[PDB]
């Protein structure tokens, strides 16, 4: 079966419930059932088939609030359902995946930078705290490459970083890793062909577009290509082996801009533009809805 590009939530103006599906292939944008509650901020991953969306903010009119919420959403069945809450509200979190569990890293909620990490298990719908980073980090890239949890960049409240650290799940502890060349939070960062790729960000002063990448055997952090676009608070995702930017802020405009990273030519194209601009956004891959 095929795989969609799934974006969920967002900000433009204020929070977004919005779940679409991407279909690199076809073009299309496909309108799925909405987020139980508007958020931004969330990051978006993909365990046994089914999208999390985690933690992030709801900006409302009527007020704003930090969530630890943990939603599912099938898309056999086109439905959302709600999961046991983080110990705490996570905005501007970021999530990898390890051994089939959620890992929840860093974000805010109100004024407090987290450095605290915890897991989730789904076959038990329970949370759990593991040791905390070495760094306070809100607007953190997280990625995982051989079963590793790396946390990248982010803002401690006073300083955006370009500094990275990895956990290791079963030592249960951080350690410092080479720092990326540029500083950078909400930037988006994934893996791809066993590399970790850190994509755009703001370093509080521009927003970025240059991109680079971790090779874990050299331990050195290597400029690609740069992004077409300058873009903080992207979703990005990985796809039949192309990288996929999606949305973002660029100190002006709210993009709704998609470009696509070919690692064979070292190439960035925009393939598509989303329905409408937004930031903040969770992405991740799984299978099409049925119907
Ligand atoms: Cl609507
Ligand atoms: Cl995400
Ligand atoms: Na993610
Ligand atoms: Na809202
Ligand atoms: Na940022």
Redesign the pocket.
Known sequence: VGRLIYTAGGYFRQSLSYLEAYNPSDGTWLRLADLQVPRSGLAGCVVGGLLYAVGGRNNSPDGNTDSSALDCYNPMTNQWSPCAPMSVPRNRIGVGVIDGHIYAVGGSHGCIHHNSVERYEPERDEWHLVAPMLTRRI?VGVAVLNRLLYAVGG?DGTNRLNSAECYYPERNEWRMITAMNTIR??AGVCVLHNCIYAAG??DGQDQLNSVERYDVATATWTFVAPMKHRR??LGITVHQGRIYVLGGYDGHTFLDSVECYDPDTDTWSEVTRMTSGRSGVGVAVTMEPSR
């Open positions: 607007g803002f939070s909400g960000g703001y903080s608070a």
